[PDB]
Amino acid sequence: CAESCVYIPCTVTALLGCSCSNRVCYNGIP
């Protein structure tokens, strides 16, 4: 996903169902 949760939880990618992992939002794809 195009969002890093390093300092903040997924926002745009949150709507995509992106989960925070290794400080970066992922959901099958980055």
Curated annotation (Swiss-Prot):
Covalent link location (Cyclopeptide (Gly-Asn)): G28-N27
Statement: the UniProt record of this protein carries the keyword Disulfide bond: yes
Disulphide bridges: C1-C18, C5-C20, C10-C25
Keywords noted in UniProt: Disulfide bond, Knottin, Plant defense
Modification after translation: This is a cyclic peptide.
A Pfam short name: Cyclotide
Tissue: Expressed in leaves, petals, petioles and roots but not in runners (at protein level).
Similarity field: Belongs to the cyclotide family. Bracelet subfamily.
Name recorded for this polypeptide: Cycloviolacin-O1
Organism: Viola odorata (Sweet violet)
Taxon lineage: Eukaryota, Viridiplantae, Streptophyta, Embryophyta, Tracheophyta
